Structure formats: C-alpha cells, structure tokens
Amino acid sequence: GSTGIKPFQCTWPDCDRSFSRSDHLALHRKRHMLV
C-alpha cells in the first residue's frame, strides 16, 4: 500500500525514500553523502 508517509523520511529528492527504521535510514543517509 501507500507507505511513503513516514517520519524517518529520507530527504533525498531524486531518491524519495521513507523509513520506519532509524538504524536503516541512518546508514541509508550516511551512504547518501558517501560517508
């Protein structure tokens, strides 16, 4: 279903990801800035 309305939303425009896991979106975001 529509599970894009998440509080842990990735703020990458071309990506447009949204998470429920803080430990997942953290690494997802770390790899975004290539760190």
Distance in angstroms (rounded) separating the CA atoms of residues 6 and 21: 10
CA pseudo-torsion sign 13, 17, 20, 22: negative
Q: Is 19 in the site for Zn ion (CB under 5 A)?
A: no
Of the candidate residues 12, 21, 24, 26, the single one contacting Zn ion (CB under 5 A): 12
Of the candidate residues 6, 9, 15, 26, the single one contacting Zn ion (CB under 5 A): 15
Min dist CB 18 to Zn ion, Å, is: 9
Residue holding tokens 């998440």? 6
Binding site for Zn ion (CB under 5 A): 10, 12, 15, 17
